[PDB]
Amino acid sequence: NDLIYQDEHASLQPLEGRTVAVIGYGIQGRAFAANLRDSGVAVRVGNIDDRYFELARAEGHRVTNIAEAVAHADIVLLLIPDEAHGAVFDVDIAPNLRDGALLCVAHGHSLVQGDVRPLPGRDLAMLAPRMYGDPIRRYYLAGQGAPAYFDIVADHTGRARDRVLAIARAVGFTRAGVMALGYRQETFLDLFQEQFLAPALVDLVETGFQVLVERGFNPKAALLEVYGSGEMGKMMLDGADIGLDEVVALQGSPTCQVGYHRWRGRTLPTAVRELAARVLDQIEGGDFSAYLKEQASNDYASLDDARRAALKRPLNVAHAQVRAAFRFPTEAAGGLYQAAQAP
Amino acid sequence: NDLIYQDEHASLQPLEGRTVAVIGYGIQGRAFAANLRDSGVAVRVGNIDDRYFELARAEGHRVTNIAEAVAHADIVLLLIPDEAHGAVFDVDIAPNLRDGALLCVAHGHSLVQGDVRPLPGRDLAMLAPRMYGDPIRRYYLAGQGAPAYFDIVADHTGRARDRVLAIARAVGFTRAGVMALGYRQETFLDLFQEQFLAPALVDLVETGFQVLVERGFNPKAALLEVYGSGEMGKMMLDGADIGLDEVVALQGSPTCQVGYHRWRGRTLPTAVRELAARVLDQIEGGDFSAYLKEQASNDYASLDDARRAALKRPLNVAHAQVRAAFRFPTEAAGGLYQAA
Ligand SMILES: NC(=O)c1ccc[n+]([C@@H]2O[C@H](COP(=O)([O-])OP(=O)(O)OC[C@H]3O[C@@H](n4cnc5c(N)ncnc54)[C@H](O)[C@@H]3O)[C@@H](O)[C@H]2O)c1
Ligand SMILES: NC(=O)c1ccc[n+]([C@@H]2O[C@H](COP(=O)([O-])OP(=O)(O)OC[C@H]3O[C@@H](n4cnc5c(N)ncnc54)[C@H](O)[C@@H]3O)[C@@H](O)[C@H]2O)c1
Ligand SMILES: O=C(O)C1(C(=O)O)CC1
Ligand SMILES: O=C(O)C1(C(=O)O)CC1
Ligand SMILES: [Mg+2]
Ligand SMILES: [Mg+2]
Ligand SMILES: [Mg+2]
Ligand SMILES: [Mg+2]
């Protein structure tokens, strides 16, 4: 039933002689810009006057204001925060978007809210990666890719689909798989992962730490076991490949497997499933959308306070103590986004 | 304060002219054996007559029964399942362990239950890695390592500490850090991660999947979001480096950060931390030890049924469908454990 594109279902032919304007040079923008350039696609970056403008210049990109980038582009990727879409679309994009040009968003939220809208004579699409920037870039350089969902919202040209999938191939998403999914469903899925799953996973790791520390366990050891060692991370990432219960079957001692299966499906009270439903209601009904616009109206002042408050929590105090005392294995990220060969 | 050993705090000098018997060639045994050999340490494998014996032979090791390996070793690493420690210790190890030899376990359970005990004239220690085999081997080959906890239980020789830490350096654990921790605390801590945290994390991922599917979301998309994409896994592994809240701050869109910080610290009712306490009580009070021994009866037949049942849960049915339709980034594992 599902429509999933891999390398055999896309080509770079539709990008021959075309310029892509990458609007934004943040988590997504930098990854798209780097992968597109290395794939032999003509890229220019449109960015406001901030640290990202200078980074784009530092990493060898042709950088201008947003309006000028859009004016000289056949394809425009709008890779800036979703609350900024409305103003940038109205002022910078819509007036400068050429006849037959394609506009892409990496998240359906601005489409659901009507902040980005179809324009006569132009194509509108969602190409939404299921991964953040650093892994999109590392996977690409390894001849691999992150998954993505796509939706052709408007297709005046009749060539929107092949151009979207050509971008997807150039950035490496088709090496994993690019699946058709409506922008509205993508929005709700995406916000659910960020508002229920991620907070609940960290809350669970934190609960583990807090209980162990209170029961007289060495705080450094407690932190390492609940995530600091990387073991829980490796389980979840290896789990993505072969399956979560399968990782336990293959890599777990009999003691570990017996323990795991004793409590598997018995740890959570019904209230967690009930909360998941409540979070979806806030996301679908407009409650979250209103909450977000209030938080954005102050240049995310509340968010800055929350971020600084989070670093004071015992879990993050213990993290700093563990990281100073134990060396964690990491790859050098220095030249990660500088020019490379097509893999 | 905490006693943490790195490469500057250990050497391979104590292993000069010493033979290490790796007892078992499973998840830990294979990684210990491979890393010790590549570090220029003399290694022997002691194993019962099963697939692991043939694998050890296939990967170029000297392989014998457990009794023979122990008899020809200055250091013995007991890397077999914990319920098998008692019988192997009494029949195969204790009668054959040389004067001034060192016995190491990688988990304190058999020490707590008194299935492995101090022997006159001999050293007994725990060196417990905080990671499973494949990552320990990949890390080692990249000039890296995983953390470990160690405990010198009996030191007749007076040289147990430097011999245990020499093993830790040879296998690569000192590249991360090797911290002193009591075998009793290690036991309870290790079982807590396996019995509360790991089940609770998968239970939560499964709850996310089952709610999305129930609400009419694309099952493949639902599965990908809750872990299948690798995004949740990458967050947790990157989080080990820089902190979980910090990953969100660095890698999250403003929309993501606002959503995250709305429910952060508010998702779990008090009942979750209460169940965590109950799991620890079972681990500390002997309830789990009794359960494990019952489960070990008839070569873990109950566990075999649980493993087969797990593969048929909606989550794992959806995983197989996703993994068939979406290619995941993997690294070649062929000859990962062959000589470097
Ligand atoms: N974070 C991710 O990994 C990720 C994943 C998939 C989808 N997305 C989507 O990609 C888009 C970009 O998100 P991101 O995480 O890269 O964001 P980010 O916070 O990294 O964005 C920074 C970029 O946005 C620009 N910017 C910020 N405020 C602006 C404004 N008012 N006007 C113009 N430009 C402004 C900055 O100059 C910079 O180039 C969003 O639609 C988001 O939902 C992000
Ligand atoms: N699994 C891990 O990654 C991990 C991590 C840290 C600590 N440990 C500890 O390492 C030890 C070994 O665990 P593992 O995960 O490698 O186990 P495993 O399931 O991989 O063990 C298989 C090995 O044990 C041998 N074996 C099995 N039953 C035996 C028996 N009755 N008598 C003799 N040999 C027998 C097999 O021949 C084989 O060599 C345990 O004490 C465990 O707690 C394991
Ligand atoms: O680290 C441990 O203890 C594991 C085990 O199987 O015992 C790998 C999980
Ligand atoms: O910040 C975002 O929006 C993420 C996404 O995948 O949508 C990275 C989490
Ligand atoms: Mg997402
Ligand atoms: Mg998002
Ligand atoms: Mg264990
Ligand atoms: Mg462990």
Numbering used by the authors:
A (entry chain B): 2 to 344
B (entry chain A): 2 to 341
The publication says:
A trait of BP bacteria is a conserved gene cluster coding for the biosynthesis of polyketides (malleicyprols) with a reactive cyclopropanol unit that is critical for virulence. We show that BurG, an unusual NAD+-dependent member of the ketol-acid reductoisomerase family, constructs the strained cyclopropanol ring. A sequence similarity search using BLAST predicted that BurG belongs to the family of ketol-acid reductoisomerases (KARIs; EC 1.1.1.86), well-characterized enzymes that play key roles in the biosynthesis of branched-chain amino acids. Biochemical assays and a suite of eight crystal structures of native and mutated BurG with bound analogues and inhibitors provide snapshots of each step of the complex reaction mechanism, involving a concealed oxidoreduction and a C–S bond cleavage.
We raised crystals of holo-BurG in the absence or presence of 7 as surrogate and solved the structures at a resolution of 1.8 Å and 1.9 Å, respectively. The head region (C1–C3) of all co-crystallized ligands was consistently found to be firmly locked in a conserved binding mode that is facilitated by interactions with the two Mg2+ ions of the enzyme (e for unliganded holo structure).
